[PDB]
Symmetry: C2
Subunit: 137 residues, 2 copies
Amino acid sequence: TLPPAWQPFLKDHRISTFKNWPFLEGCACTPERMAEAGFIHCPTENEPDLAQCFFCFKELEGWEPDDDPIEEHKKASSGCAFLSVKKQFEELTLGEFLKLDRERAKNKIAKETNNKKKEFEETAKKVRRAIEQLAAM
Amino acid sequence: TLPPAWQPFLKDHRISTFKNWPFLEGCACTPERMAEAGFIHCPTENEPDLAQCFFCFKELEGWEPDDDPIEEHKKASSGCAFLSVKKQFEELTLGEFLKLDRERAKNKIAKETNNKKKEFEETAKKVRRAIEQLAAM
Ligand SMILES: [Zn+2]
Ligand SMILES: [Zn+2]
């Protein structure tokens, strides 16, 4: 049905992204529970339990079986409008839904900005060090 | 911003299809008016004022300046759900909107079916007349 860009708004889409997730039956942080919290699984060679809110884009690793994903999302990112959304998908008005997607688009830009900044700052330090060293010789 | 498949639900998208529409300021069937009624312009060399409901797919030609496009859509296609939609786009719930699109998908199939019927019937005549010409000898 829905365009790719929008699928992550659907719990079932999100749940389906957890394949090879280690915390199943018996655990607090099940794929159902991770997805109810907004998380999408997106693991790396390095961090294979990496999860991301689809809406605010915060990443969390180091999950333990007892972790309650809502309490964790709340702790890591209290700003996230998804956490205030009470209604189900189909109960939302298009006005509301379009508003939420505008905000997600902004959240995304923000993370891309803040990233480019940290990378730029780190480059600035390499360049600066290198010119200190040259002045020194 | 919205998938192509869905744009026609938007008045302004529909208005924008009227390219070379002859009934403008002064007329009852203005593009704004046609669009409010669900029509998209889709002319041919042959029928250059051809207009189609985006929702029930009824086609109407032979438009005159005093024609009110809602009264005409009502006359030509009394059972078109778009005509019951009182709410604006943004006021609809996704559940409602998904329901409406399911129905437009059915209306489309139905029209593709009824068209294929007419084509079959018109072929049936060519075959019939061709066989009569052969038997007569
Ligand atoms: Zn979030
Ligand atoms: Zn119609």
